[PDB]
Design a protein around this ligand. Sequence first.
Ligand SMILES: [Zn+2]
Ligand SMILES: [Zn+2]
Ligand SMILES: [Zn+2]
Ligand SMILES: [Zn+2]
Ligand SMILES: [Zn+2]
Lengths: 265, 185, 109, 263, 329
Amino acid sequence: ANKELEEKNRMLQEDPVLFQLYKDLVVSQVISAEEFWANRSDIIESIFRTYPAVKMKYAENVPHNMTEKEFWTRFFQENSNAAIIKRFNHHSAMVLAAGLRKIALNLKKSDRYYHGPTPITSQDIINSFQSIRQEMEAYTPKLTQVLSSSAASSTITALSPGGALMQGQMVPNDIQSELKHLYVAVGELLRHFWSCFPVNTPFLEEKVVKMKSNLERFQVTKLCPFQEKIRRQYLSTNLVSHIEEMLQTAYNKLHTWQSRRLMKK
Amino acid sequence: YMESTVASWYEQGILENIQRNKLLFIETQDGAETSVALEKYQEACENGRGAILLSVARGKVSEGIDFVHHYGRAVIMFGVPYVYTQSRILKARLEYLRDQFQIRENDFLTFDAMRHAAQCVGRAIRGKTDYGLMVFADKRFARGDKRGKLPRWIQEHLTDANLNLTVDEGVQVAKYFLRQMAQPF
Amino acid sequence: MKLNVDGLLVYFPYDYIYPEQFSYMRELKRTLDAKGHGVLEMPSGTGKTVSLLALIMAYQRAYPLEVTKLIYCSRTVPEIEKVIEELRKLLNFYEKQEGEKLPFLGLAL
Amino acid sequence: LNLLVIVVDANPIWWGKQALKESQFTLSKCIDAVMVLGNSHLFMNRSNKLAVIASHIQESRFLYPGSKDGKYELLTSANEVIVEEIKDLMTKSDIKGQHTETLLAGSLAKALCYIHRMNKEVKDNQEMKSRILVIKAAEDSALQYMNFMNVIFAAQKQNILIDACVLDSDSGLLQQACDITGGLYLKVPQMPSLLQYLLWVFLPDQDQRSQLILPPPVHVDYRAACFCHRNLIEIGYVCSVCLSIFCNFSPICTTCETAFKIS
Amino acid sequence: VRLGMMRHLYVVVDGSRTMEDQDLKPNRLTCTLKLLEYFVEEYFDQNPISQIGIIVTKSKRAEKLTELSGNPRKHITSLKKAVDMTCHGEPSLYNSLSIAMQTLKHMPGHTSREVLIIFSSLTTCDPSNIYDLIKTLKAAKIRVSVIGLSAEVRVCTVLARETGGTYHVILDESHYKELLTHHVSPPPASSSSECSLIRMGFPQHTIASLSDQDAKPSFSMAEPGLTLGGYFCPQCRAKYCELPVECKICGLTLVSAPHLARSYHHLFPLDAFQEIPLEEYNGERFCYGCQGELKDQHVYVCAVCQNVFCVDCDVFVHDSLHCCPGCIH
Ligand SMILES: [Zn+2]
Ligand SMILES: [Zn+2]
Ligand SMILES: [Zn+2]
Ligand SMILES: [Zn+2]
Ligand SMILES: [Zn+2]
């Protein structure tokens, strides 16, 4: 069955971003689209599941020279007294059948938390203690001692934007959407490329897919710089270099892990 | 009487709403259907669907069955259980008791009703201290004679405050009591 | 759980008994001592069986000649099965307490 | 209204080192500047209230629960009480060579619970916007990180702003602390001119802080390190019990003793 | 007692008809959502590494209102949107638990998978028997702790006790607050629970290097404008607006040191202070904690520092600060 074709038809226009990115991976003819998907009323229904007799009657009386309104009409249509009780018993039983398908912790080192990840003679204490004890025999010098005009003016100049302690562009708009779309594409493909990269996966069938994805990295990064070139030759302003870091770091991880694999071998 | 009430509820929309809220099962004279219905009722109780089992006080099912925790949580009694006043066997049984041992006919009749009601309503307290409420939808039980003939353990718990609650008031107090019993000891 | 009943000492398998159980046991012992037929009512569907059986067994041990045997009748066989289960549990508890088998027989027809 | 709390780090070791150095700045002038700041805070409005806490190696003590010079009676009482209590505390103090690092987490905890008590007692009609103007004066202690982080998170939940005013040293823990709760962080390099910094940067309350230009916040280095040699690490291997940042993958983390299963 | 610091929790809300009944002072659904907003915010504030997910079940169908995420604001917005939900239909425990199981099946073993079903309508119409699903839940070690409303449901009682969770029924709104606040805290790890090391990444806030030289412009990663500076990743190298967040590429949790430090108080619970009403030779009128006179005949003291704390001081210390001020010294 063409289940893949049916799913592609379903998502062709319902979701714009998914199909946009999937098509983009083919617009420049980067790779085959197989890997894309390889890696990644109520009343009538209730009666249908409730009454098997109604199911059989529907199968035998499928619309043929008749009308669904007439079929609806056929639905509602001491001997009768006991029939009602029997009908409730059977109907509740049918509904129920349809719903019934066939360590105390101990530690040895706690001061490590007291000094967490945050990083970092005797007569001196005596001298400082006595000196500070004798320091404050006089109090309330506020009248002049606390502040002076020259120091205050220096402080205000420092607080000025050009002073110390106080150091002090949305021009492009349409480029924003293009950058967002490119970032989404990079994320989409990096997701699969990094899906199993951190895990060692020392198996043949597991490593085959990482090798294929690593080649796909080369093949996608082949086309990325061409769009980069198109965008660059406009004004030579507001450089977009963050995208380069992702590609270069992915390449560095790829090559370093390749060297590590060779060393392990 | 059960069939007549069920038929009236079916003609009205009350029965359909009850069916929506919870599953409904009914008792019949034939033992096979009774057993099948009760077997499905137990599974309904185990599951979250729930079940409302309509039965007759004199029915053999009422005496044979025993209701425990999460089984027959709320016991509803629709009408005082009285045998038909036409069965001539009870006429001999009753007038002979009046003639000998000196028991009033009404006294023995009310005793036969209260004993049967206690039999069919005392199951929910089987054991293990499993909560449950017994609601009697009949103003006759509010009469002093019925209360006096009621078993002591039920009657002493019963109080005048809740003796003749309206339908809505009874529902509210039942909800509150179920809240209280839900929490652990 | 050995209860120092007024008449005698009676063993009991479960840990605790409600005051209504004390009242039941004392009234039942009064009836047995009087050796006269009587009637009594207890609410609980279960628990009454164990209390009654324990009191009857203790009374039999104290005065074996007074009571030849116990004839305990129940409405239905499915119900009497639960009674025989309770009696089996009580006998196991008493046998563990005594440390050995005793000439006691119990059966259902 | 506003409830201000000044947590002064009056560490005798460091302030007496300044006294021995005979530098221009002194603990007396620091206390006077803090006093002036509190007086101005209450001067702002009648409903406003203030409190003061000192910080010593042993413990931390509150410095605050006619018109002889023609003075406002309430501020006169504040001046007298703070002067007397600070002199008493500085004059009387035991010596313990083992413990010399200044204590700040306990003082901040006292401030937080004091603010909670005042918030409970005050009438519900008036809303209180409390603040803690921490004034550090010495290097922090490594062993206090955990408790200080607890109190900082409690302050974040309770909506109190920790305005740090470190001087002579940049405490990474304290800057991290104020960053979490959004309090301002000012590092005054001119100690003599400290009070001008208070009457501008710190004095304005949270109500008017947004609608005012103040020095930009300093970048915070949220570093992580393994429990072995104490060094920056970008990737941490924590477990589900210790929640401890470690060096490298190990069969079992020492602080856990759990029976980790390989895979 | 071993505690699972990292837990993926699903708050299953039922859009049943019974929620329409205004048993509480406001509408039942509105009250539950309003308080669940506070529950979500407090849960994130008391367990940053953990993440939450909301499944709304109505008309016999369960829909994921919000997938697993580390951002409380998004879930809060989802709650506010759901406040206006129609609230018609019947819930399905099988459907809701199956959706939760499908999402939680691929979750890492080390993290504790938990579900809190806020059950309102006692009925449970499900396509398949839930007793069978109970076996799969036990196999998958997904803790399920139901909170019933106005009903002691038997199927949910057995669900909770068999799966290891706890069952409760709302006595009133105040007790509802207490129940959810209690469920906020991490549950103790039982024998079935297992612990394993989890890879973690610690990013550093970065800005323009020097006067916007060699800048790193970027918009966001899950209408974001250009950002001069922000957080980054050791491996993604993709700008992140806020932390903590799971990597969109690596699959590794990015979280800073304070977020981890926020959970140490769980490992270090504070021992309850004995309450002595009498003064007991406590001549200090001022309470040490708050330096205020003790206006009530109550005092609290530790077993180490032996200090004095009033009612408010002790309550606050054991509730929020989670550490004794004087006893820190
Ligand atoms: Zn290391
Ligand atoms: Zn560990
Ligand atoms: Zn990443
Ligand atoms: Zn206090
Ligand atoms: Zn203490």
